[PDB]
Amino acid sequence: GVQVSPSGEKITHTGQVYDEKDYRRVRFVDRQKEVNENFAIDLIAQQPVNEVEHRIIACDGGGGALGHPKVYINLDKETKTGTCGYCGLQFKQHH
Amino acid sequence: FAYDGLKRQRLTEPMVRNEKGLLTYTSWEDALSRVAGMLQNFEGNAVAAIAGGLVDAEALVALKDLLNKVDSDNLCTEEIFPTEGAGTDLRSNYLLNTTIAGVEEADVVLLVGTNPRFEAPLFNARIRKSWLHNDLKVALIGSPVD
Amino acid sequence: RSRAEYVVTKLDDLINWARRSSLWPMTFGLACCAVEMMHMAAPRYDMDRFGVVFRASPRQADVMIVAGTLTNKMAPALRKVYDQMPEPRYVVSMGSCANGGGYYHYSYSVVRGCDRIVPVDIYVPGCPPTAEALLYGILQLQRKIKREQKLKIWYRR
Amino acid sequence: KRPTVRPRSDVTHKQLSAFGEYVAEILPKYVQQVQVSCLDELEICIHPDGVIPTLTFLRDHTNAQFKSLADLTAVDVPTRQNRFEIVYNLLSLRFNSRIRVKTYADELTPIDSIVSVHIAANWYEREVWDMFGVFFFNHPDLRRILTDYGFEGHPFRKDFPLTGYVELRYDDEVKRVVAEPVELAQEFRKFDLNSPWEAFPAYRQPPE
Amino acid sequence: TSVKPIFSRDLNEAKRRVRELYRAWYREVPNTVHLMQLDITVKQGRDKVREMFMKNAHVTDPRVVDLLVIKGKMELQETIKVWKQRTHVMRFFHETETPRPKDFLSKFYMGHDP
Amino acid sequence: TQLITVDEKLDITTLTGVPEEHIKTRKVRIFVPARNNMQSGVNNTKKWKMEFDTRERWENPLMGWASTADPLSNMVLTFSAKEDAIAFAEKNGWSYDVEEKKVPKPKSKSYGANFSWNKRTRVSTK
Amino acid sequence: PTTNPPTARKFIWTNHKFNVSATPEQYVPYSTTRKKIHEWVPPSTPYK
Amino acid sequence: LHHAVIPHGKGGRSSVSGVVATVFGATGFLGRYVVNHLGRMGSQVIIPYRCDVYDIMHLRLMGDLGQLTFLEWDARDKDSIRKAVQHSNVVINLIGREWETRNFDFEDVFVNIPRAIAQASKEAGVERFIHVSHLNASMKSSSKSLRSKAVGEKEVRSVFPEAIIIRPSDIFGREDRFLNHFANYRWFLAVPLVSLGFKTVKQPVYVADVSKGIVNATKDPDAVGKTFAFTGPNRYLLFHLVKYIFGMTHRTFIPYPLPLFVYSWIGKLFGLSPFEPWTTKDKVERIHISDVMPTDLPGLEDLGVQPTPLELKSIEVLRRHRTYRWLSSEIEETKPAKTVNY
Amino acid sequence: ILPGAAYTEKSATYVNTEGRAQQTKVAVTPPGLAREDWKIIRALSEIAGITLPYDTLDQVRNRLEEVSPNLVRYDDIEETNYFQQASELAKLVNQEVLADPLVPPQLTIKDFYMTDSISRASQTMAKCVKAVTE
Amino acid sequence: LGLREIRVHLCQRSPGSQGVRDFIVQRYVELKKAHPNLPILIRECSEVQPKLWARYAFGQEKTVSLNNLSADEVTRAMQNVLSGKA
């Protein structure tokens, strides 16, 4: 989530933060640095892994035509989850 | 893939030594004045230059023309080449005279003390191509390398 | 603070209110954005009910609404009529072209934003902004004028 | 009958082809090429000397009567030695037909003005001079029309850059709008879009 | 090397038109300075006319000279008619432009451009 | 109208409105673009191209965008022949470098070579 | 929205904000990407 | 250098000059030219202002998007001074007032405030400090404000020893209080001058020359720690200068002598205006102090600026002071002023 | 230290192992205050009063032609000769080979990835070295 | 006027360089034995007028055109630069 650098400036979800000696920090004086606080990397990691009965699962992201292009995920490797390349949801084969 | 080396450890500013002997940033005016001042105290063998492996010919000839103007001839390269005999007088003495595309016309290639795979990977590919399509015979004097 | 400062502050409110309540824009429009300006004057929005009245003379205008694309050939003329407005005067930049060149930002013939030519008080986005979006910007100019503190600053000099 | 394909008739192609032969037989001194496209549009390509005779013939001849100049423009093709193609698009109300007359020019060879044939051409020829730098002989009043006063160059040439060479701003020191060399906070990003696979074999050019 | 002329058959005939245009520009400067209320002398206006003519002194092709004169007559026309504004006439003097230094060292310090 | 004799190089540089800096200090490259090695299609290796020498791009302090002062940074002109491109550069007063077109060499392909009795062309896999 | 409420999502703002232009809360643009080119850092210790 | 302040581009509006300047007093006469010269080469300019935002509006177009930063400040509040200088590599002080107000006297404006600004800039680690003073600044001056400037020069160098001090003569330009001031004597029909203006020598300087020199001093390596005198090319007696001004406005010039003690009393009367005084006692004193003869100190030429003659630029200031009859009169119709060498 | 340009940031001449001259083109300009390397030397010569006689890239390549005309013939193999003469002079050289076996500096793939300053500074090259070692 | 280096430029096929080509086959090995530490840089290149460059102390270079000369005239021309002056 949002952390602060030693200069006190918030660090973004892209890792951006001005140096302490960066003059461009002047632009936030008496104003503010806009930083979205809901990091997608943290929220997607909070989702539980989906357990399925097959070795191929299809993900369209939910909502049918409101999600993402339907893709098929291979679940043969038992040492890791199959992750959807669009929406980041994880799936695992039951056995 | 080594192009990402171009984004690291880059020299972006002139540097000179300060009172404490550390390198500090300075302007082009200042750094070139310091070098020009020393270049006028010395001449002859007192001035030399070593060219590295990624230097272009424009800078090489510019550097040579500069040192010659103070009567120095110690323009040197890090890579050795024998100076006995013809030395670098004749171009045929230090070139791949058969050319890269000439490898496809040979029938015996004798490699002496070289690992062409890693020293010239595309030249080694040309050898394998001839080995494959012309039945080229290859012999090596040197360490047994793949 | 003091009663002299209180009186000065109430006078700032009064003069500010007068300029808020009688904003007269120049009859001045450059391209498609001016069509939506007509629709702000039209009956549904009726800008005149807020006290906003077009006058054709720069000498009788308070606001310039840069409503459309500003070309290099037009730029000196726009600067001229801005300079000929008596003060206090305000500028509203309306639409992407005036805001920063818009669809024509990369043209050889177009000024990339009227704020290279005149100072701008309000930037109204859109291509064109709706008549309502322009009206919102006009009401944002009024609130800006409400914040002017010229007499308070004079008193503290 | 194939709902997505545009329907075609042969009648207009035949009519336009025959009139193309007619025009070529009457004006052999000037006519260099006649063609009818599969969009059924007739183009007469002429030597530049023939502009006034050709366009006078098409306006006034009883079997032509192209009395309305729809538009007059240029095309810059830098690979041609005569890089400017001059296009006249003409309308005949009598026969409800359209024709295109094309000639060419280079940077140092003016075309004749056709204002004596169509007064409509007056501003169009000014536009061609302004945008492409092609001069017109015997024009009543030839001068820039779209560009700014004192503008240098002809911006519709292919080698004139999109954003030009100069930009404008107000300078408070001199108290006026001033012209300065163009400097862009974001450069226009050039996209390479063409597919490296051929799209239309009907237009494949000889391998040479 | 056989070309159509525009107006002048040779560079000598073209030079005659150049001198006529120069006379017209020379006589116009005082009227323009007065009518546009330019903050320059008449001498400074005529020196600028001279400098603009000598920017093209190297041209030998009679056709190019013909077209330079044609354009020079147009610029004169929009100046006499006062179609040009003061901003337009003052553009010839580049009064806010810091000129690029011409020596190698100054360009080396500034940046990478030749 | 009659013809006149103009025995000099065609040079239209005074009529183009280009600033002098962008005539004399520029270098154009006349070349046929190489095939994009990511694709086998060859349709983009058929025309001659003229492009200008690349100049400085820098970071915009506000947004980080790529800024430029080079008005010719995007100019690309297409030509049907090397000689057309050379002619166009010369009349515009641009110094140019011309690179010869590269055609892939003709090759001998023999599917039967994959199964040779006694040659190294025999493939170990299909 | 009383009888037809919108879908609940955890990331949706719970507190609406009006236009905050020309206040200390106004948006200020800035590049969101990190430094691309890295300089060489000279040694801290001297050399003789 | 931090990579963000390496100069890039070709010196235009979208370029990066490397200069990060805080310009105090940017909302007055000299300041608008200084901001313009900084902003046109692609500098970041921090502009502290205490006036209404309406009064800074003309500065907003002087720089590319994001290159001008307007901050509120109070000369009393020491935190707003530190807030305004904490990111800049040069600080330029142009604070001044030609009269004293209820809340700020000449010591406040020319001593206390400059010292506070220089103090904060030294502790923030600002690389360069440029302070504008006056050619005739002196501890033994008849003018109270010119005495204040002399003390301020010494207090500024006591906290920022490397400070660059700029000493201009009277500065003429479109918004000056010099050529416009004398041109406006037409309203009183006759022009008083102490000793008829024959005992005062002036060497006025053009505003765009001063700003150009000030902006060149932000980058000049050889400028640090020095005092510069920014004067125009020519010296004039106050009589001939005023006569030339009335010649350029084509207004009837009727000079008459007036003793200084009567003249100072009139200055006190006009000084009672609660708005911007038309003149003050100090203004009268400064008009009749002669500019000091050039010796020793470097000038505009040392900073790469050629002084612009008053004869080249006066009409752009004085044409608006003509009636309709004389509006279109050209520069050459006015006879130039006679010059002195002492 | 005088910061110079890398091969991606200059129009510079290189000759390959066949003797073929080829030139790079500028793709991006040098970072920071770095400059084209021949221009640094040309600037240095002026400060030192020994100005070199060329101010442009074209002029420096005219000089390259004076010193060796093959260096400006781009993409050409200029044929050589006189190996016989070189071998005659080699015959007179009285030195003897040592018994040390011929061992190339690079023996395995792990030695291939990092051989100059650019590849030593590449983080991709470091990943390659680690992968083929661990 | 201390000689530092000689450069010989010639074509490989042009008849104008036939003399310079003969000079190299005949005299070069003898010349290199006489001056084992003098760089004599022979640089062939197609379609070049043959030339002789002599570089002296402090970067002074003199040029001699060997075009359409004989092997002895090239020997004569070359001995001048090595021997001294004329």
Ligand SMILES: NC(=O)C1=CN([C@@H]2O[C@H](COP(=O)(O)OP(=O)(O)OC[C@H]3O[C@@H](n4cnc5c(N)ncnc54)[C@H](OP(=O)(O)O)[C@@H]3O)[C@@H](O)[C@H]2O)C=CC1
């Ligand atoms: N002839 C001349 O003009 C000469 C001028 N100088 C000096 O150069 C500098 C600028 O000259 P000029 O531009 O004519 O001066 P101006 O009076 O035109 O501008 C003065 C500046 O100082 C600011 N200022 C004044 N008092 C205060 C204060 N109490 N608190 C905060 N800010 C304040 C003003 O801000 P606001 O507008 O908000 O009050 C304004 O921006 C001054 O130091 C002046 O003495 C030197 C030689 C001659």
Ligand code: SF4
């Ligand atoms: S912003 Fe859009 S609607 Fe407005 S003038 Fe420009 S193109 Fe037209």
Ligand SMILES: [Zn+2]
């Ligand atoms: Zn998904």
